[PDB]
Design a protein around this ligand. Structure first.
Ligand SMILES: CCc1ccc(O)cc1
Ligand SMILES: CCc1ccc(O)cc1
Ligand SMILES: [Cl-]
Ligand SMILES: [Cl-]
Ligand SMILES: [Cl-]
Ligand SMILES: [Cl-]
Ligand SMILES: [Cl-]
Ligand SMILES: [Zn+2]
Ligand SMILES: [Zn+2]
Ligand SMILES: [Zn+2]
Lengths: 141, 142
């Protein structure tokens, strides 16, 4: 259940920048009744405050639904389930759609090969490198 | 995997599915080859129904495809009744902007009110207005 946020990427960089709604750092994930109960940390007023969310299962495997900053269609992917986890969030807020990609590792960092693939996959969709934030190299919660 | 009709279109940006919109295309058929989806659509251009052939390539994930059209697209297929209808959700990336276009296909020009109702409510439940849904089963199109 132990996880670390290693890379964040978004169509809207502000979503993952400081004070951003999706700049959350995963701590652990526990599966209950097929749902994903996530415990995250987020920074506010200088301190690390807990954030508990639940991504509910859907009729589709690896697809979940999450109510946060609007609604989100969440997709899980991983070729190495015990080494990393990739979660793609399609966020709908005020009629606006954005994609937020999360790369989780068992420890604070991940192999360059895994990070490179995640990053190139994001950029190949038509996004700039600047919209990728590798936080393994940052002092966060 | 064969004969289809576009019954309902819905999008985060209505201009995308309105007249002259890049996603206002009417499916005619889908042929599966090497796991890829070869689609044949019709599009209205200058009072003329012009053919549009596209291929959605398979990915490492089932029911997920990649399509190069009006930028890039992550395409997801869903259906509780595969022989009755097909739902395709397009996550379009155009000039750094993301939009969602949902397509509801039927074996014939129209679909049950139940199926259309669920499709439409699922769309609106995500935070979109009813006006962004276009039921084209009630309009003369290609
Ligand atoms: C990062 C994916 C996720 C979101 C919410 C949640 O509760 C658990 C996992
Ligand atoms: C509407 C889904 C679809 C897109 C492209 C394609 O080639 C086949 C099906
Ligand atoms: Cl660790
Ligand atoms: Cl630790
Ligand atoms: Cl626009
Ligand atoms: Cl028919
Ligand atoms: Cl027909
Ligand atoms: Zn750790
Ligand atoms: Zn527009
Ligand atoms: Zn027909």
């Amino acid at each position: 259940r132990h996880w670390h946020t290693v890379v964040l990427a978004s169509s809207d960089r502000s979503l993952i920048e400081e004070e951003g709604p999706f700049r959350n750092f995963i701590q652990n994930i526990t599966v209950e009744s097929g749902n994903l109960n996530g415990f995250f940390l987020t920074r506010k007023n200088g301190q690390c405050i807990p954030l508990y969310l639940t991504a509910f299962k859907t009729e589709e495997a690896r697809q979940f639904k999450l109510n946060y900053y609007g609604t989100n269609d969440v997709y899980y992917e991983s070729s190495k389930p015990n080494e990393y986890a990739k979660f793609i969030f399609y966020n709908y807020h005020d009629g606006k759609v954005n994609v937020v990609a999360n790369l989780f590792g068992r420890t604070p960092n991940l192999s360059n090969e895994i990070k490179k693939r995640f990053e190139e996959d994001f950029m190949n969709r038509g996004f700039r490198r600047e919209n990728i934030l590798d936080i393994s190299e940052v002092d966060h919660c």
